Amino acid sequence: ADVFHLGLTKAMLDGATLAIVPGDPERVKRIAELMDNATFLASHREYTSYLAYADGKPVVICSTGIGGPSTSIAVEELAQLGVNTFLRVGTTGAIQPHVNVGDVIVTQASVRLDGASLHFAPMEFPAVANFECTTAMVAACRDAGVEPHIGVTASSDTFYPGQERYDTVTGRVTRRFAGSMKEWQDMGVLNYEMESATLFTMCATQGWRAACVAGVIVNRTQQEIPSAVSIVVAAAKKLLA
Template sequence: MSEGNHDVFHLGLNRSDLEGAEIALIPGDPGRVPKIATHLENARDLANTREYRSMLGFSGETPVLVMSTGIGGPSAAIAVEELALLGVKRFLRIGTTGAIQPHIEASDVVITTAAVRMDGASRHIAPQEYPAVADFHMVRRLVAAAERIGARYHLGVTASSDTFYQGQGRKDSFRKGFVHRELANKIEELQNLNVLSYEMEAGTVLTQTSAYGLGGACISGVLVNRTRAEFPDAAVIGETVLKTIQVAIASLKED
């Protein structure tokens, strides 16, 4: 990383650190950054501050930034804001998700076309009526990549919740089963609206990128189907994360 003052407040990065990168792969987990970067060429560390760990690599001659955003919309919104200030134009979230439709299996991938905005951060960017939609061209590339490598995928709407427990209808929180009335039957409502899964960042990222005239997309590995289980099989996690990364990286090579 270059010395001197940083160009943005939180990320520990200068514009020159990115070497002209206009695409960012943004997982939530800092530990997932090197797992993604290993699929790029000549990857190197940039910074590691707060929840934002960053590395730079190349897909052919194209510089690609990999940077974690932490959990949830507020920290993801900071990441998108500051990376946009540094010249990034396309944001591909690589995450995990819990399916709520019975036909989706653990280890499948979900490619988000739009997100239900159950977050708070996106409301600071655009009014609630504004849709959280993915960039068509990025979605098309993800679909083509999944088909090329033989990954089973599902295309559709996901729900972005600010909370992992109450907002996603889990009954194993501290208050053992209590969810206030606005959320008590939310999972059934979303299932009936053909929402595929819960995650925590796409609503913010897609609202923000659309409102800013940037490109945004989200691919998530399915760790568990919540119509059958609440906790993922440990053996499935590594396989699912790897498959999701492979599809995301492969999408960079699509014309």
């Protein structure tokens, strides 16, 4: 391979410059098969990668794993092989009561509750998505009869205390995060997930385009524990046309 973790070479990508980057390795083949000629590339650690064709254009589909650290490896190594655009498709918990399970959120920018973003820029830098890519995501939603929620997401390095979940072994949340969900609710933040702050900060600072769409699987105003994929594919087609 020509990269350290992913097991890929540039030739395997057939000129792809755009990647769809789900968190879950098990979702990669499913996404690839929404496109044409889905082709296995590699699987190592949490990084499963496929190639497929979106209206004739090559697209890499590669899992990131959960969290900014594993995401940062995948993004860098794909960029080493010529990828310059990264479309995340994920799952998310809504924190606003008006967002329903099954809805779609397009993240414009993220609250940086991660560590890896700080390995690309100091905190003052905004974890903002690429405008053109966000625009394509919104258009793809509307083409499908979905009005997405568009706004700010809290992007956390933990699933449990950093999303102010209390149904845990200790039931404690450290002072920094105690009360934090209500703070983000009051600031209009839509939802929590675990990769977008890293993704957006690393891509914005390194000259790559990023965007994120996620399906809502729980509403945190109700409970702690309970398609986006069709939209991300449609957005990829818009961007590669």
